[PDB]
Symmetry: C3
Subunit: 345 residues, 3 copies
């Protein structure tokens, strides 16, 4: 609704934060640091940008105490914080732009709930959502339009599920979980026995999917259920869009899987891992904790020790960095085998 | 059986196109030029050398004025146009297979429409679709069965939204846009802050997504919203299936993204660009106008000049072509040290 | 969930046992962490090391494999069938499938008067069956799914929730389709003005899914401009897969998650396409060809065998290539020091 302006000083008092420069500077929105004019509050997160600070027009830059110590002399208007400058920036963001809901509060009449399903306090089920037999929908839970909550599936308190998500049977979603539109949770794992005449016999997958607390699942991401055990995404992990997660995959706590990456069956990913965009990881292997996998990686063996890895096959960062450099240098190496065929003897 | 027969001349008059050949020739279907028979209507590509034309045994051949000039002397039945042969072929095709909707005209009773939302005239909203608060659906739109138009979002006139599409809140769709089944427009960016030794906190994404006119978005493709700025697909760009558009990516006009490709956050892609299938582009870069990236390209840095690119990391095409070759020639280069090490006399 | 003894299990399975047939067992579990109460099996090799020291109450094992471990004092169940299959027979003794609790045709189903629905068929809340569709007997139509105009579903097929089937698609007998899939979206074909502009062409071809095909979650299959796209019988397709327009997938082929096949390409019978592999348009893949994950096929393949890499090359050749690439620092040695006989200046 708004088109609000506030004074630098007003913003500071709001943010409960120290400031230097004109208290009366007028600020009408937020903007990233390179683009920002005198109308905008902005931030610098960590040194990545730097060059963009002394030239910036920003009428206010949100800064940390160390960065203020580092940039003290520059003639800018600062808001000095001890929290993440990006996280203080978010507070400003939320001043100018407020979230918006669908405008269908509580349980819409068109929402179908099976008699055996248990509905908790303060829940919101949107038009045309379907809750199946013996499902548990938690307290303060949001279920979006045309979403499905399958048989025996449970959705822990404060979870938010966007429009057209499919939560198959026997899936348990933890607390404070966010699922973007299109996500499929609990699809059949891709398991066959090929007969001698080359015909593929389906193996009925009767496992579960466990998605733990504070996990996020992206748009149109598909997580398959295990054959008999469980596919698991552990507490705090964040999964981007269009991601494959095959039967009996386990993802650790506080891990990140970027868009369009895929992980084959019975692979375990450790805690605090990053899987880069469009990466691929085979079945029946492990990734150790604190591993970062670059974008477009093909990982063919377990990665046993922490560090950065890239390429396909995946090799440690230094080894692949060298490999690329040497491949670019083949023309210059043939030139050296050339000069050598200058031999008279 | 064929629902229809026409004479060359009858069809010429239907198409509003000149003809050259035998006006009485009978025509009862369409086929591609290398498979067409006497009863068939076909078109001349734009490629396809003279040999394709000559040995074609087809009742009629849709051709352009320029091409005709070059092939005046050939005894074929020609349907000569100043438009694109294919576009004209299209109309011919539509005489043998007629397009079919779902059979639910106008606004279905089961559609749910928030009182605060404004639905223009002549709109088709199919069964079980939801239109949220302060949404605006323009005149002559189609909202597919079960699709969702989010809070405050706008759809321009003559847009076709197929079934089970999610348009999230604050999304702007222009005129004549087509969105395939299952697409997701305005999901949240993948943007987090890291605290407590690598725990990831959610950052509310409150920017919009802007889709300009004549843009097409393929099936199950996902287009995230910016953090505060906007994700933008410009005029006339066409996006395939299973594509990822990351937070606040800007795509130029008349650019093409092929299936399964992905652009990471905050990247600019200029006009007349083509991103081949299953490609990846990192965040915070630029692709100049008129760039073509081959399938499975992995782009790591900006591209500032036009032309074809491939490989991962992406290099100009000339480059990865020599590379593949020198790599392939590795044994034959090692064989040359199996000989240039025998000469080690004294 | 109950308990059985080895002997009872052997007799149920019609399979021979070795070890003590009094051993009580009550569940299943992967080969490593199987206790005396768990049944397990061995059907690859990468977990074979876990056998010597595994504690399973029962190990289902092939006649061939049994030779290598029959000396160990583990309880074995020995079969000449698929160990995995025999294992499945056990699995189903402890866990049972669950339906949604909505039998037959839910009153919210919206069915067009001109559609035909056979006997003994389930249609779950808010499904939408459009004009001139036919749904065979013993079919399951999952919640919020769409069956488009003139589309048919063969008997005993299972459509999971939120599946979209567009116009003129024919699903064969006993097919499974996972949530989110999209069958019969528009092919990615445009007429490109010389000027750069891209013009839409309604795709009107039919799409055919033959009996026993399985299609994965969120997989998208496009229809041809006017000619047909076919998935021949028995083929299994995984999640997030792109099948572009006019593709023929031969019979009993496997396509793994996130693969993509480009336009009007023909895949043989008994073909395996690995995860994230890509195949260009207008080419051919011979019978019994196996692509590895992340393969990039750029040319037709005609000889059966294992293929990998990008561009695709036969197994032993890409192996050797990776090998010679890794070797490059070592090969530079034999060069650096080969050059350092400019000491032959004397
Ligand atoms: C230095 C050599 C590394 C090997 C080259 C491949 C990956 C480089 C890392 C940057 C990202 C690659 C492009 C994919 C981007 C994406 O999908 O989001
Ligand atoms: C880039 C596709 C256009 C066709 C022109 C031929 C260029 C060679 C194909 C690029 C190499 C990658 C092969 C995978 C193809 C795909 O994913 O669709
Ligand atoms: C980009 C490939 C060319 C180079 C040589 C290719 C052989 C090794 C790469 C195989 C990747 C296997 C990773 C599995 C990915 C997945 O499961 O989806």
């Amino acid at each position: 609704m708004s088109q609000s302006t506030y004074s630098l000083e007003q913003l500071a008092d709001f943010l409960k934060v120290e400031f230097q420069g004109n208290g009366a500077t007028l600020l009408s929105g937020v903007e990233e640091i390179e683009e920002a004019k005198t109308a905008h509050i902005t931030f610098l997160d960590n040194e990545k940008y730097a060059k963009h600070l002394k030239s910036s027009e920003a009428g206010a830059i949100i800064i940390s105490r160390t960065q203020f110590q580092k940039y003290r002399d520059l003639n800018k208007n600062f808001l000095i914080t001890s929290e993440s400058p990006s996280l203080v920036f978010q507070k400003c963001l939320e001043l100018f732009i407020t979230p918006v809901d669908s405008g269908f509060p509580g349980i819409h009449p068109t929402a179908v709930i099976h008699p055996t399903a248990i509905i908790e306090d303060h829940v919101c089920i949107e038009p045309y959502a379907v809750v199946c037999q013996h499902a548990h929908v938690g307290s303060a839970c949001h279920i979006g339009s045309g979403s499905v909550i399958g048989a025996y599936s449970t959705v822990g308190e404060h979870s938010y599920i966007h429009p057209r998500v499919v939560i198959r049977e026997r899936v348990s979603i933890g607390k404070r979980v966010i699922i973007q539109p299109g996500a499929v949770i609990g699809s059949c794992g891709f398991g066959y026995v090929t007969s001698a005449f080359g015909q593929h016999k389906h193996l009925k997958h009767l496992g579960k999917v466990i998605i733990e607390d504070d996990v996020e699942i992206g748009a149109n991401t598909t997580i398959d259920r295990g054959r008999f055990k469980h596919s698991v995404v552990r507490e705090g992990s964040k999964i981007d869009n269009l991601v494959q997660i095959a039967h009996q995959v386990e993802v650790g706590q506080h891990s990140m899987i970027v868009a369009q990456a895929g992980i084959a069956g019975s692979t375990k990913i450790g805690n605090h891992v990053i899987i880069g965009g469009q990466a691929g990881i085979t079945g029946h292997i492990c990734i150790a904790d604190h591993v970062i996998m670059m974008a477009q990686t093909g990982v063919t063996k377990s990665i046993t020790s922490p560090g950065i890895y890239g390429g396909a096959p995946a090799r440690p960062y230094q080894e692949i960095h060298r490999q690329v450099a040497k491949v670019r240098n083949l023309p210059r190496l043939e030139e050296r085998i050339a000069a050598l065929e200058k031999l008279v003897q």
